[PDB]
PDB file of C-alpha atoms and ligand atoms in Angstrom:
ATOM      1  CA  UNK A   1     -13.107  48.293  -2.884  1.00  0.00           C
ATOM      2  CA  UNK A   2     -10.244  47.197  -0.635  1.00  0.00           C
ATOM      3  CA  UNK A   3      -7.254  49.394   0.147  1.00  0.00           C
ATOM      4  CA  UNK A   4      -3.832  48.003   1.002  1.00  0.00           C
ATOM      5  CA  UNK A   5      -0.775  50.075   1.865  1.00  0.00           C
ATOM      6  CA  UNK A   6       2.579  48.931   0.528  1.00  0.00           C
ATOM      7  CA  UNK A   7       5.742  49.871   2.398  1.00  0.00           C
ATOM      8  CA  UNK A   8       9.188  48.509   3.079  1.00  0.00           C
ATOM      9  CA  UNK A   9       9.754  47.067   6.558  1.00  0.00           C
ATOM     10  CA  UNK A  10      12.273  49.872   7.220  1.00  0.00           C
ATOM     11  CA  UNK A  11       9.380  52.378   7.308  1.00  0.00           C
ATOM     12  CA  UNK A  12       7.122  50.639   9.862  1.00  0.00           C
ATOM     13  CA  UNK A  13       7.833  53.136  12.683  1.00  0.00           C
ATOM     14  CA  UNK A  14       6.358  55.943  10.539  1.00  0.00           C
ATOM     15  CA  UNK A  15       2.960  54.172  10.714  1.00  0.00           C
ATOM     16  CA  UNK A  16       2.461  54.023  14.506  1.00  0.00           C
ATOM     17  CA  UNK A  17      -1.358  53.922  14.255  1.00  0.00           C
ATOM     18  CA  UNK A  18      -1.549  51.465  11.325  1.00  0.00           C
ATOM     19  CA  UNK A  19      -3.173  48.619  13.276  1.00  0.00           C
ATOM     20  CA  UNK A  20      -5.597  51.059  14.947  1.00  0.00           C
ATOM     21  CA  UNK A  21      -6.321  52.517  11.499  1.00  0.00           C
ATOM     22  CA  UNK A  22      -7.224  49.070  10.114  1.00  0.00           C
ATOM     23  CA  UNK A  23      -9.216  47.656  13.053  1.00  0.00           C
ATOM     24  CA  UNK A  24     -10.904  50.756  14.516  1.00  0.00           C
ATOM     25  CA  UNK A  25     -10.911  53.625  12.007  1.00  0.00           C
ATOM     26  CA  UNK A  26     -11.216  51.409   8.887  1.00  0.00           C
ATOM     27  CA  UNK A  27      -9.234  54.017   6.922  1.00  0.00           C
ATOM     28  CA  UNK A  28      -7.608  51.098   5.109  1.00  0.00           C
ATOM     29  CA  UNK A  29      -7.858  47.297   5.120  1.00  0.00           C
ATOM     30  CA  UNK A  30      -4.308  45.925   5.081  1.00  0.00           C
ATOM     31  CA  UNK A  31      -0.614  46.361   4.364  1.00  0.00           C
ATOM     32  CA  UNK A  32       2.094  44.648   2.388  1.00  0.00           C
ATOM     33  CA  UNK A  33       5.272  45.133   4.416  1.00  0.00           C
ATOM     34  CA  UNK A  34       8.272  44.306   2.227  1.00  0.00           C
ATOM     35  CA  UNK A  35      11.431  42.622   3.512  1.00  0.00           C
ATOM     36  CA  UNK A  36      10.295  41.935   7.075  1.00  0.00           C
ATOM     37  CA  UNK A  37      12.605  38.931   6.858  1.00  0.00           C
ATOM     38  CA  UNK A  38      15.538  38.628   4.448  1.00  0.00           C
ATOM     39  CA  UNK A  39      15.180  36.251   1.489  1.00  0.00           C
ATOM     40  CA  UNK A  40      18.098  34.233   2.924  1.00  0.00           C
ATOM     41  CA  UNK A  41      16.286  33.631   6.215  1.00  0.00           C
ATOM     42  CA  UNK A  42      13.160  32.470   4.372  1.00  0.00           C
ATOM     43  CA  UNK A  43      15.156  30.089   2.153  1.00  0.00           C
ATOM     44  CA  UNK A  44      17.041  28.777   5.206  1.00  0.00           C
ATOM     45  CA  UNK A  45      13.782  27.996   7.008  1.00  0.00           C
ATOM     46  CA  UNK A  46      12.302  26.389   3.878  1.00  0.00           C
ATOM     47  CA  UNK A  47      15.425  24.193   3.580  1.00  0.00           C
ATOM     48  CA  UNK A  48      15.118  23.138   7.234  1.00  0.00           C
ATOM     49  CA  UNK A  49      11.600  21.901   6.403  1.00  0.00           C
ATOM     50  CA  UNK A  50      12.757  20.274   3.132  1.00  0.00           C
ATOM     51  CA  UNK A  51      15.869  18.614   4.576  1.00  0.00           C
ATOM     52  CA  UNK A  52      14.131  17.524   7.803  1.00  0.00           C
ATOM     53  CA  UNK A  53      16.426  19.328  10.277  1.00  0.00           C
ATOM     54  CA  UNK A  54      13.550  21.539  11.413  1.00  0.00           C
ATOM     55  CA  UNK A  55      13.860  21.479  15.224  1.00  0.00           C
ATOM     56  CA  UNK A  56      10.934  19.031  15.528  1.00  0.00           C
ATOM     57  CA  UNK A  57       8.480  20.959  13.345  1.00  0.00           C
ATOM     58  CA  UNK A  58       7.528  17.901  11.232  1.00  0.00           C
ATOM     59  CA  UNK A  59       6.485  16.025  14.407  1.00  0.00           C
ATOM     60  CA  UNK A  60       3.506  18.439  14.637  1.00  0.00           C
ATOM     61  CA  UNK A  61       2.510  18.454  10.945  1.00  0.00           C
ATOM     62  CA  UNK A  62      -1.250  18.134  10.428  1.00  0.00           C
ATOM     63  CA  UNK A  63      -1.949  16.929   6.887  1.00  0.00           C
ATOM     64  CA  UNK A  64      -5.726  17.523   7.201  1.00  0.00           C
ATOM     65  CA  UNK A  65      -6.426  14.819   4.585  1.00  0.00           C
ATOM     66  CA  UNK A  66     -10.101  14.563   5.622  1.00  0.00           C
ATOM     67  CA  UNK A  67     -10.708  18.027   4.075  1.00  0.00           C
ATOM     68  CA  UNK A  68      -9.067  17.361   0.692  1.00  0.00           C
ATOM     69  CA  UNK A  69      -7.803  20.176  -1.523  1.00  0.00           C
ATOM     70  CA  UNK A  70      -9.696  22.996   0.212  1.00  0.00           C
ATOM     71  CA  UNK A  71      -7.227  23.324   3.115  1.00  0.00           C
ATOM     72  CA  UNK A  72      -3.476  23.496   3.634  1.00  0.00           C
ATOM     73  CA  UNK A  73      -1.217  21.222   5.629  1.00  0.00           C
ATOM     74  CA  UNK A  74      -0.471  22.964   8.911  1.00  0.00           C
ATOM     75  CA  UNK A  75       2.620  22.624  11.109  1.00  0.00           C
ATOM     76  CA  UNK A  76       1.240  22.901  14.633  1.00  0.00           C
ATOM     77  CA  UNK A  77      -2.451  22.965  15.451  1.00  0.00           C
ATOM     78  CA  UNK A  78      -4.200  26.158  14.444  1.00  0.00           C
ATOM     79  CA  UNK A  79      -6.743  27.500  16.934  1.00  0.00           C
ATOM     80  CA  UNK A  80      -9.411  26.760  14.309  1.00  0.00           C
ATOM     81  CA  UNK A  81     -11.270  23.481  14.951  1.00  0.00           C
ATOM     82  CA  UNK A  82      -9.834  22.508  18.325  1.00  0.00           C
ATOM     83  CA  UNK A  83     -11.623  21.178  21.380  1.00  0.00           C
ATOM     84  CA  UNK A  84     -12.269  24.004  23.901  1.00  0.00           C
ATOM     85  CA  UNK A  85      -9.773  22.406  26.344  1.00  0.00           C
ATOM     86  CA  UNK A  86      -6.970  23.018  23.793  1.00  0.00           C
ATOM     87  CA  UNK A  87      -4.809  20.218  25.245  1.00  0.00           C
ATOM     88  CA  UNK A  88      -3.391  19.136  21.873  1.00  0.00           C
ATOM     89  CA  UNK A  89      -3.131  22.766  20.718  1.00  0.00           C
ATOM     90  CA  UNK A  90      -0.989  23.743  23.728  1.00  0.00           C
ATOM     91  CA  UNK A  91       1.248  20.680  23.239  1.00  0.00           C
ATOM     92  CA  UNK A  92       1.971  21.549  19.587  1.00  0.00           C
ATOM     93  CA  UNK A  93       2.156  25.286  20.355  1.00  0.00           C
ATOM     94  CA  UNK A  94       5.066  24.666  22.725  1.00  0.00           C
ATOM     95  CA  UNK A  95       6.874  22.559  20.121  1.00  0.00           C
ATOM     96  CA  UNK A  96       6.153  25.101  17.370  1.00  0.00           C
ATOM     97  CA  UNK A  97       7.782  27.933  19.306  1.00  0.00           C
ATOM     98  CA  UNK A  98      11.041  26.125  20.069  1.00  0.00           C
ATOM     99  CA  UNK A  99      11.169  24.620  16.556  1.00  0.00           C
ATOM    100  CA  UNK A 100      10.506  27.973  14.861  1.00  0.00           C
ATOM    101  CA  UNK A 101      13.070  29.639  17.145  1.00  0.00           C
ATOM    102  CA  UNK A 102      15.605  26.947  16.165  1.00  0.00           C
ATOM    103  CA  UNK A 103      15.042  27.250  12.395  1.00  0.00           C
ATOM    104  CA  UNK A 104      15.311  31.071  12.339  1.00  0.00           C
ATOM    105  CA  UNK A 105      18.611  31.067  14.281  1.00  0.00           C
ATOM    106  CA  UNK A 106      17.998  34.659  15.420  1.00  0.00           C
ATOM    107  CA  UNK A 107      18.560  35.899  11.856  1.00  0.00           C
ATOM    108  CA  UNK A 108      16.341  37.511  12.916  1.00  0.00           C
ATOM    109  CA  UNK A 109      14.205  35.529  15.370  1.00  0.00           C
ATOM    110  CA  UNK A 110      10.653  35.069  14.060  1.00  0.00           C
ATOM    111  CA  UNK A 111       8.811  36.159  17.213  1.00  0.00           C
ATOM    112  CA  UNK A 112      11.105  39.129  17.929  1.00  0.00           C
ATOM    113  CA  UNK A 113      10.861  40.482  14.381  1.00  0.00           C
ATOM    114  CA  UNK A 114       7.102  39.921  14.101  1.00  0.00           C
ATOM    115  CA  UNK A 115       6.563  41.534  17.526  1.00  0.00           C
ATOM    116  CA  UNK A 116       8.837  44.408  16.501  1.00  0.00           C
ATOM    117  CA  UNK A 117       6.710  45.027  13.392  1.00  0.00           C
ATOM    118  CA  UNK A 118       3.396  44.898  15.266  1.00  0.00           C
ATOM    119  CA  UNK A 119       4.893  47.133  17.942  1.00  0.00           C
ATOM    120  CA  UNK A 120       6.016  49.766  15.404  1.00  0.00           C
ATOM    121  CA  UNK A 121       2.582  49.695  13.739  1.00  0.00           C
ATOM    122  CA  UNK A 122       0.693  50.216  17.028  1.00  0.00           C
ATOM    123  CA  UNK A 123       3.003  51.728  19.673  1.00  0.00           C
ATOM    124  CA  UNK A 124       1.791  48.929  21.948  1.00  0.00           C
ATOM    125  CA  UNK A 125       3.355  45.960  23.704  1.00  0.00           C
ATOM    126  CA  UNK A 126       2.958  42.709  21.760  1.00  0.00           C
ATOM    127  CA  UNK A 127       2.571  39.286  23.343  1.00  0.00           C
ATOM    128  CA  UNK A 128       1.595  35.724  22.604  1.00  0.00           C
ATOM    129  CA  UNK A 129      -1.513  34.834  24.648  1.00  0.00           C
ATOM    130  CA  UNK A 130      -1.260  32.551  27.684  1.00  0.00           C
ATOM    131  CA  UNK A 131      -3.605  29.665  28.511  1.00  0.00           C
ATOM    132  CA  UNK A 132      -5.588  29.153  31.753  1.00  0.00           C
ATOM    133  CA  UNK A 133      -2.729  27.111  33.287  1.00  0.00           C
ATOM    134  CA  UNK A 134       0.074  29.240  31.808  1.00  0.00           C
ATOM    135  CA  UNK A 135       0.267  27.268  28.538  1.00  0.00           C
ATOM    136  CA  UNK A 136       1.688  29.239  25.623  1.00  0.00           C
ATOM    137  CA  UNK A 137      -0.442  29.783  22.544  1.00  0.00           C
ATOM    138  CA  UNK A 138       1.495  29.435  19.301  1.00  0.00           C
ATOM    139  CA  UNK A 139       2.479  32.769  17.672  1.00  0.00           C
ATOM    140  CA  UNK A 140       2.085  31.186  14.243  1.00  0.00           C
ATOM    141  CA  UNK A 141       1.471  28.015  12.312  1.00  0.00           C
ATOM    142  CA  UNK A 142       3.231  27.160   9.059  1.00  0.00           C
ATOM    143  CA  UNK A 143       0.795  26.580   6.200  1.00  0.00           C
ATOM    144  CA  UNK A 144       1.884  24.266   3.386  1.00  0.00           C
ATOM    145  CA  UNK A 145      -0.183  24.260   0.186  1.00  0.00           C
ATOM    146  CA  UNK A 146       0.863  21.579  -2.298  1.00  0.00           C
ATOM    147  CA  UNK A 147       0.020  21.639  -6.013  1.00  0.00           C
ATOM    148  CA  UNK A 148      -3.742  21.600  -6.609  1.00  0.00           C
ATOM    149  CA  UNK A 149      -4.464  22.617  -3.016  1.00  0.00           C
ATOM    150  CA  UNK A 150      -6.142  25.852  -1.979  1.00  0.00           C
ATOM    151  CA  UNK A 151      -7.404  27.444   1.234  1.00  0.00           C
ATOM    152  CA  UNK A 152     -11.197  27.546   1.195  1.00  0.00           C
ATOM    153  CA  UNK A 153     -12.993  30.846   1.594  1.00  0.00           C
ATOM    154  CA  UNK A 154     -13.595  31.906   5.192  1.00  0.00           C
ATOM    155  CA  UNK A 155     -13.443  34.904   7.486  1.00  0.00           C
ATOM    156  CA  UNK A 156     -11.487  35.408  10.695  1.00  0.00           C
ATOM    157  CA  UNK A 157     -14.134  36.800  13.052  1.00  0.00           C
ATOM    158  CA  UNK A 158     -16.041  33.507  12.778  1.00  0.00           C
ATOM    159  CA  UNK A 159     -13.058  31.829  14.475  1.00  0.00           C
ATOM    160  CA  UNK A 160     -13.548  33.903  17.639  1.00  0.00           C
ATOM    161  CA  UNK A 161     -17.081  32.452  17.930  1.00  0.00           C
ATOM    162  CA  UNK A 162     -15.850  28.831  17.747  1.00  0.00           C
ATOM    163  CA  UNK A 163     -15.536  26.731  20.970  1.00  0.00           C
ATOM    164  CA  UNK A 164     -11.707  26.672  20.614  1.00  0.00           C
ATOM    165  CA  UNK A 165     -11.539  30.465  21.035  1.00  0.00           C
ATOM    166  CA  UNK A 166     -13.443  30.413  24.365  1.00  0.00           C
ATOM    167  CA  UNK A 167     -10.334  31.390  26.342  1.00  0.00           C
ATOM    168  CA  UNK A 168      -8.925  33.811  23.725  1.00  0.00           C
ATOM    169  CA  UNK A 169     -12.284  35.583  23.617  1.00  0.00           C
ATOM    170  CA  UNK A 170     -11.917  36.531  27.307  1.00  0.00           C
ATOM    171  CA  UNK A 171      -8.552  38.234  26.647  1.00  0.00           C
ATOM    172  CA  UNK A 172      -9.563  40.113  23.489  1.00  0.00           C
ATOM    173  CA  UNK A 173     -11.312  43.320  22.590  1.00  0.00           C
ATOM    174  CA  UNK A 174     -14.429  42.405  20.610  1.00  0.00           C
ATOM    175  CA  UNK A 175     -13.048  44.245  17.532  1.00  0.00           C
ATOM    176  CA  UNK A 176     -11.845  42.681  14.273  1.00  0.00           C
ATOM    177  CA  UNK A 177      -9.049  40.122  14.405  1.00  0.00           C
ATOM    178  CA  UNK A 178      -6.402  40.846  11.794  1.00  0.00           C
ATOM    179  CA  UNK A 179      -4.560  38.202   9.833  1.00  0.00           C
ATOM    180  CA  UNK A 180      -0.853  38.182   9.102  1.00  0.00           C
ATOM    181  CA  UNK A 181       1.392  35.886   7.124  1.00  0.00           C
ATOM    182  CA  UNK A 182       4.854  35.764   5.627  1.00  0.00           C
ATOM    183  CA  UNK A 183       5.627  33.542   2.656  1.00  0.00           C
ATOM    184  CA  UNK A 184       8.613  31.280   3.242  1.00  0.00           C
ATOM    185  CA  UNK A 185       8.248  29.993  -0.325  1.00  0.00           C
ATOM    186  CA  UNK A 186       5.926  31.138  -3.121  1.00  0.00           C
ATOM    187  CA  UNK A 187       4.468  28.914  -5.865  1.00  0.00           C
ATOM    188  CA  UNK A 188       5.169  29.304  -9.587  1.00  0.00           C
ATOM    189  CA  UNK A 189       1.601  30.537 -10.064  1.00  0.00           C
ATOM    190  CA  UNK A 190      -1.661  30.793  -8.120  1.00  0.00           C
ATOM    191  CA  UNK A 191      -1.551  30.695  -4.324  1.00  0.00           C
ATOM    192  CA  UNK A 192      -2.704  34.302  -4.180  1.00  0.00           C
ATOM    193  CA  UNK A 193      -4.582  35.719  -1.230  1.00  0.00           C
ATOM    194  CA  UNK A 194      -7.892  36.675  -2.812  1.00  0.00           C
ATOM    195  CA  UNK A 195      -9.823  39.105  -0.622  1.00  0.00           C
ATOM    196  CA  UNK A 196     -13.513  39.756  -1.248  1.00  0.00           C
ATOM    197  CA  UNK A 197     -15.232  43.063  -0.541  1.00  0.00           C
ATOM    198  CA  UNK A 198     -17.980  41.118   1.304  1.00  0.00           C
ATOM    199  CA  UNK A 199     -17.936  41.931   5.034  1.00  0.00           C
ATOM    200  CA  UNK A 200     -18.503  39.567   7.959  1.00  0.00           C
ATOM    201  CA  UNK A 201     -21.658  40.378   9.893  1.00  0.00           C
ATOM    202  CA  UNK A 202     -22.305  39.513  13.567  1.00  0.00           C
ATOM    203  CA  UNK A 203     -26.031  38.838  12.939  1.00  0.00           C
ATOM    204  CA  UNK A 204     -25.217  35.749  10.809  1.00  0.00           C
ATOM    205  CA  UNK A 205     -20.919  26.670  11.742  1.00  0.00           C
ATOM    206  CA  UNK A 206     -18.593  25.186  14.405  1.00  0.00           C
ATOM    207  CA  UNK A 207     -17.961  21.783  12.779  1.00  0.00           C
ATOM    208  CA  UNK A 208     -15.316  22.526  10.158  1.00  0.00           C
ATOM    209  CA  UNK A 209     -16.488  21.068   6.830  1.00  0.00           C
ATOM    210  CA  UNK A 210     -19.944  22.381   7.767  1.00  0.00           C
ATOM    211  CA  UNK A 211     -18.424  25.850   8.297  1.00  0.00           C
ATOM    212  CA  UNK A 212     -16.501  25.846   4.998  1.00  0.00           C
ATOM    213  CA  UNK A 213     -19.612  24.816   3.035  1.00  0.00           C
ATOM    214  CA  UNK A 214     -21.693  27.445   4.848  1.00  0.00           C
ATOM    215  CA  UNK A 215     -19.251  30.200   3.807  1.00  0.00           C
ATOM    216  CA  UNK A 216     -18.833  28.905   0.224  1.00  0.00           C
ATOM    217  CA  UNK A 217     -22.620  29.167  -0.123  1.00  0.00           C
ATOM    218  CA  UNK A 218     -22.521  32.658   1.397  1.00  0.00           C
ATOM    219  CA  UNK A 219     -19.817  33.613  -1.132  1.00  0.00           C
ATOM    220  CA  UNK A 220     -21.759  32.128  -4.067  1.00  0.00           C
ATOM    221  CA  UNK A 221     -24.958  33.879  -2.908  1.00  0.00           C
ATOM    222  CA  UNK A 222     -23.249  37.320  -3.014  1.00  0.00           C
ATOM    223  CA  UNK A 223     -20.585  37.036  -5.765  1.00  0.00           C
ATOM    224  CA  UNK A 224     -19.028  40.334  -4.623  1.00  0.00           C
ATOM    225  CA  UNK A 225     -15.851  41.980  -5.960  1.00  0.00           C
ATOM    226  CA  UNK A 226     -12.364  40.665  -5.153  1.00  0.00           C
ATOM    227  CA  UNK A 227      -8.694  41.663  -5.201  1.00  0.00           C
ATOM    228  CA  UNK A 228      -5.704  39.318  -5.311  1.00  0.00           C
ATOM    229  CA  UNK A 229      -2.356  39.676  -3.520  1.00  0.00           C
ATOM    230  CA  UNK A 230       0.855  37.683  -3.915  1.00  0.00           C
ATOM    231  CA  UNK A 231       3.449  38.925  -1.414  1.00  0.00           C
ATOM    232  CA  UNK A 232       6.990  37.661  -1.942  1.00  0.00           C
ATOM    233  CA  UNK A 233       9.114  35.620   0.483  1.00  0.00           C
ATOM    234  CA  UNK A 234       9.843  37.638   3.642  1.00  0.00           C
ATOM    235  CA  UNK A 235       7.086  40.177   2.966  1.00  0.00           C
ATOM    236  CA  UNK A 236       4.388  40.431   5.634  1.00  0.00           C
ATOM    237  CA  UNK A 237       0.815  40.744   4.456  1.00  0.00           C
ATOM    238  CA  UNK A 238      -1.183  42.218   7.313  1.00  0.00           C
ATOM    239  CA  UNK A 239      -4.904  42.723   6.717  1.00  0.00           C
ATOM    240  CA  UNK A 240      -8.404  42.639   8.155  1.00  0.00           C
ATOM    241  CA  UNK A 241      -9.046  38.952   7.499  1.00  0.00           C
ATOM    242  CA  UNK A 242     -11.452  39.144  10.432  1.00  0.00           C
ATOM    243  CA  UNK A 243     -13.897  41.317   8.490  1.00  0.00           C
ATOM    244  CA  UNK A 244     -13.286  40.542   4.811  1.00  0.00           C
ATOM    245  CA  UNK A 245     -14.000  37.101   3.405  1.00  0.00           C
ATOM    246  CA  UNK A 246     -10.969  35.668   1.669  1.00  0.00           C
ATOM    247  CA  UNK A 247      -9.247  32.566   0.391  1.00  0.00           C
ATOM    248  CA  UNK A 248      -5.947  31.496  -1.131  1.00  0.00           C
ATOM    249  CA  UNK A 249      -6.229  30.525  -4.802  1.00  0.00           C
ATOM    250  CA  UNK A 250      -5.191  27.080  -6.054  1.00  0.00           C
ATOM    251  CA  UNK A 251      -1.420  26.475  -6.124  1.00  0.00           C
ATOM    252  CA  UNK A 252      -0.277  25.988  -9.738  1.00  0.00           C
ATOM    253  CA  UNK A 253       2.975  24.116 -10.422  1.00  0.00           C
ATOM    254  CA  UNK A 254       5.167  21.831  -8.324  1.00  0.00           C
ATOM    255  CA  UNK A 255       6.671  24.483  -6.007  1.00  0.00           C
ATOM    256  CA  UNK A 256       4.610  24.486  -2.790  1.00  0.00           C
ATOM    257  CA  UNK A 257       3.311  27.657  -1.151  1.00  0.00           C
ATOM    258  CA  UNK A 258       4.718  27.823   2.373  1.00  0.00           C
ATOM    259  CA  UNK A 259       3.507  30.624   4.632  1.00  0.00           C
ATOM    260  CA  UNK A 260       4.092  31.356   8.297  1.00  0.00           C
ATOM    261  CA  UNK A 261       1.280  33.374   9.776  1.00  0.00           C
ATOM    262  CA  UNK A 262      -1.587  33.757  12.165  1.00  0.00           C
ATOM    263  CA  UNK A 263      -3.773  36.411  13.710  1.00  0.00           C
ATOM    264  CA  UNK A 264      -3.550  39.483  15.895  1.00  0.00           C
ATOM    265  CA  UNK A 265      -6.029  41.575  17.857  1.00  0.00           C
ATOM    266  CA  UNK A 266      -6.298  44.164  20.604  1.00  0.00           C
ATOM    267  CA  UNK A 267      -6.459  43.052  24.206  1.00  0.00           C
ATOM    268  CA  UNK A 268      -9.700  43.747  26.104  1.00  0.00           C
ATOM    269  CA  UNK A 269      -8.549  47.260  27.105  1.00  0.00           C
ATOM    270  CA  UNK A 270      -6.788  48.052  23.772  1.00  0.00           C
ATOM    271  CA  UNK A 271      -3.514  48.451  25.706  1.00  0.00           C
ATOM    272  CA  UNK A 272      -1.771  45.465  24.113  1.00  0.00           C
ATOM    273  CA  UNK A 273      -1.581  43.388  20.947  1.00  0.00           C
ATOM    274  CA  UNK A 274      -1.971  39.638  21.129  1.00  0.00           C
ATOM    275  CA  UNK A 275      -0.819  37.499  18.246  1.00  0.00           C
ATOM    276  CA  UNK A 276      -1.316  33.793  17.678  1.00  0.00           C
ATOM    277  CA  UNK A 277      -2.399  31.106  15.227  1.00  0.00           C
TER     278      UNK A 277
HETATM  279  C1  6CU B   1      -5.813  25.955   6.277  1.00  0.00           C
HETATM  280  N1  6CU B   1      -6.249  26.376   7.114  1.00  0.00           N
HETATM  281  C2  6CU B   1      -6.843  26.996   8.295  1.00  0.00           C
HETATM  282  C3  6CU B   1      -8.362  26.911   8.277  1.00  0.00           C
HETATM  283  C4  6CU B   1      -8.918  25.622   8.238  1.00  0.00           C
HETATM  284  C5  6CU B   1     -10.063  25.666   7.517  1.00  0.00           C
HETATM  285  N2  6CU B   1     -10.573  24.438   7.510  1.00  0.00           N
HETATM  286  C6  6CU B   1      -9.782  23.636   8.217  1.00  0.00           C
HETATM  287  C7  6CU B   1      -9.879  22.329   8.488  1.00  0.00           C
HETATM  288  C8  6CU B   1      -8.915  21.698   9.266  1.00  0.00           C
HETATM  289  C9  6CU B   1      -7.851  22.452   9.743  1.00  0.00           C
HETATM  290  C10 6CU B   1      -7.801  23.808   9.423  1.00  0.00           C
HETATM  291  C11 6CU B   1      -8.757  24.369   8.671  1.00  0.00           C
HETATM  292  C12 6CU B   1     -10.296  26.966   7.027  1.00  0.00           C
HETATM  293  C13 6CU B   1     -10.849  26.932   5.588  1.00  0.00           C
HETATM  294  C14 6CU B   1     -11.261  27.738   7.956  1.00  0.00           C
HETATM  295  C15 6CU B   1      -8.858  27.483   6.997  1.00  0.00           C
HETATM  296  C16 6CU B   1      -8.614  28.986   7.029  1.00  0.00           C
HETATM  297  C17 6CU B   1      -7.087  29.205   7.041  1.00  0.00           C
HETATM  298  C18 6CU B   1      -6.409  28.498   8.246  1.00  0.00           C
HETATM  299  C19 6CU B   1      -4.880  28.594   8.095  1.00  0.00           C
HETATM  300  C20 6CU B   1      -6.798  29.202   9.544  1.00  0.00           C
HETATM  301  C21 6CU B   1      -6.154  28.776  10.860  1.00  0.00           C
HETATM  302  O1  AKG B   2      -1.825  32.324   3.504  1.00  0.00           O
HETATM  303  C1  AKG B   2      -1.986  32.036   4.708  1.00  0.00           C
HETATM  304  O2  AKG B   2      -1.120  31.441   5.381  1.00  0.00           O
HETATM  305  C2  AKG B   2      -3.270  32.413   5.407  1.00  0.00           C
HETATM  306  C3  AKG B   2      -4.267  33.092   4.474  1.00  0.00           C
HETATM  307  C4  AKG B   2      -5.392  33.657   5.311  1.00  0.00           C
HETATM  308  O3  AKG B   2      -6.504  33.150   5.292  1.00  0.00           O
HETATM  309  C5  AKG B   2      -5.139  34.807   6.176  1.00  0.00           C
HETATM  310  O4  AKG B   2      -4.086  35.465   6.030  1.00  0.00           O
HETATM  311  O5  AKG B   2      -5.982  35.095   7.051  1.00  0.00           O
HETATM  312 CL1   CL B   3      -8.883  34.543   8.726  1.00  0.00          CL
HETATM  313 FE1  FE2 B   4      -7.747  33.830   6.951  1.00  0.00          FE
END
């Protein structure tokens, strides 16, 4: 069974070892952190994406039509499924950061608030990784799930074994990568993070549709227990997506599910938190 804490964002400094407790000690598996961003800020950002005045965010929208209903539309390239050079990824990452910064209008700033949370939950400095030639990684991508669309089952630690993570790998501690996301908008029904009790195993691909099908088989071959979560707008769900297989259930109704999220992990020497998408 999976164990998620649930606290208000005001309390995050009282859980200074929370990230260590999830990744290293495994004393629990995730957290719902309520009101990390105000509801106003989330609505504002959602409007910016609706109305088009999004600081250039729509210029880096990846519809991912060649994968159908099993993925989301992603603003900015995610690290998943990129060429090891990451040329396109770094181009969109740069745009994502300035666009995100623009839409949040320091109310509060996305990166500052997210870093503040991760800092309070670890007592560590928090940074966005840097590429071989100084290129910024993106701190997040925005995931848009339209009606009928879901996010196929997968697990995060597989991503660190993909060619696109070749640089990241060198910066990171080999421990579990956590996932985080914050809903900007929630759907009328469905669109729940469903986490399975099945654990990723290092003793058991890189092409994407091939990967998704490989995991869906692995999920159907085990049929293990699951729990569903549906955090509200502005709530951060932080959990061990690296270890536990999970998906996002089909979005029911016309209201799209918009999340801003990514991943975080310890640096090589466990003296820093990196976060990215
Ligand atoms: C959606 N989504 C992302 C991952 C993703 C998948 N397949 C894709 C194909 C093309 C672009 C992205 C993906 C999987 C099912 C691994 C998706 C997991 C969730 C992601 C937001 C992770 C960056
Ligand atoms: O809902 C999202 O944006 C991502 C869901 C997910 O797979 C994760 O949090 O790792
Ligand atoms: Cl993941
Ligand atoms: Fe995930």
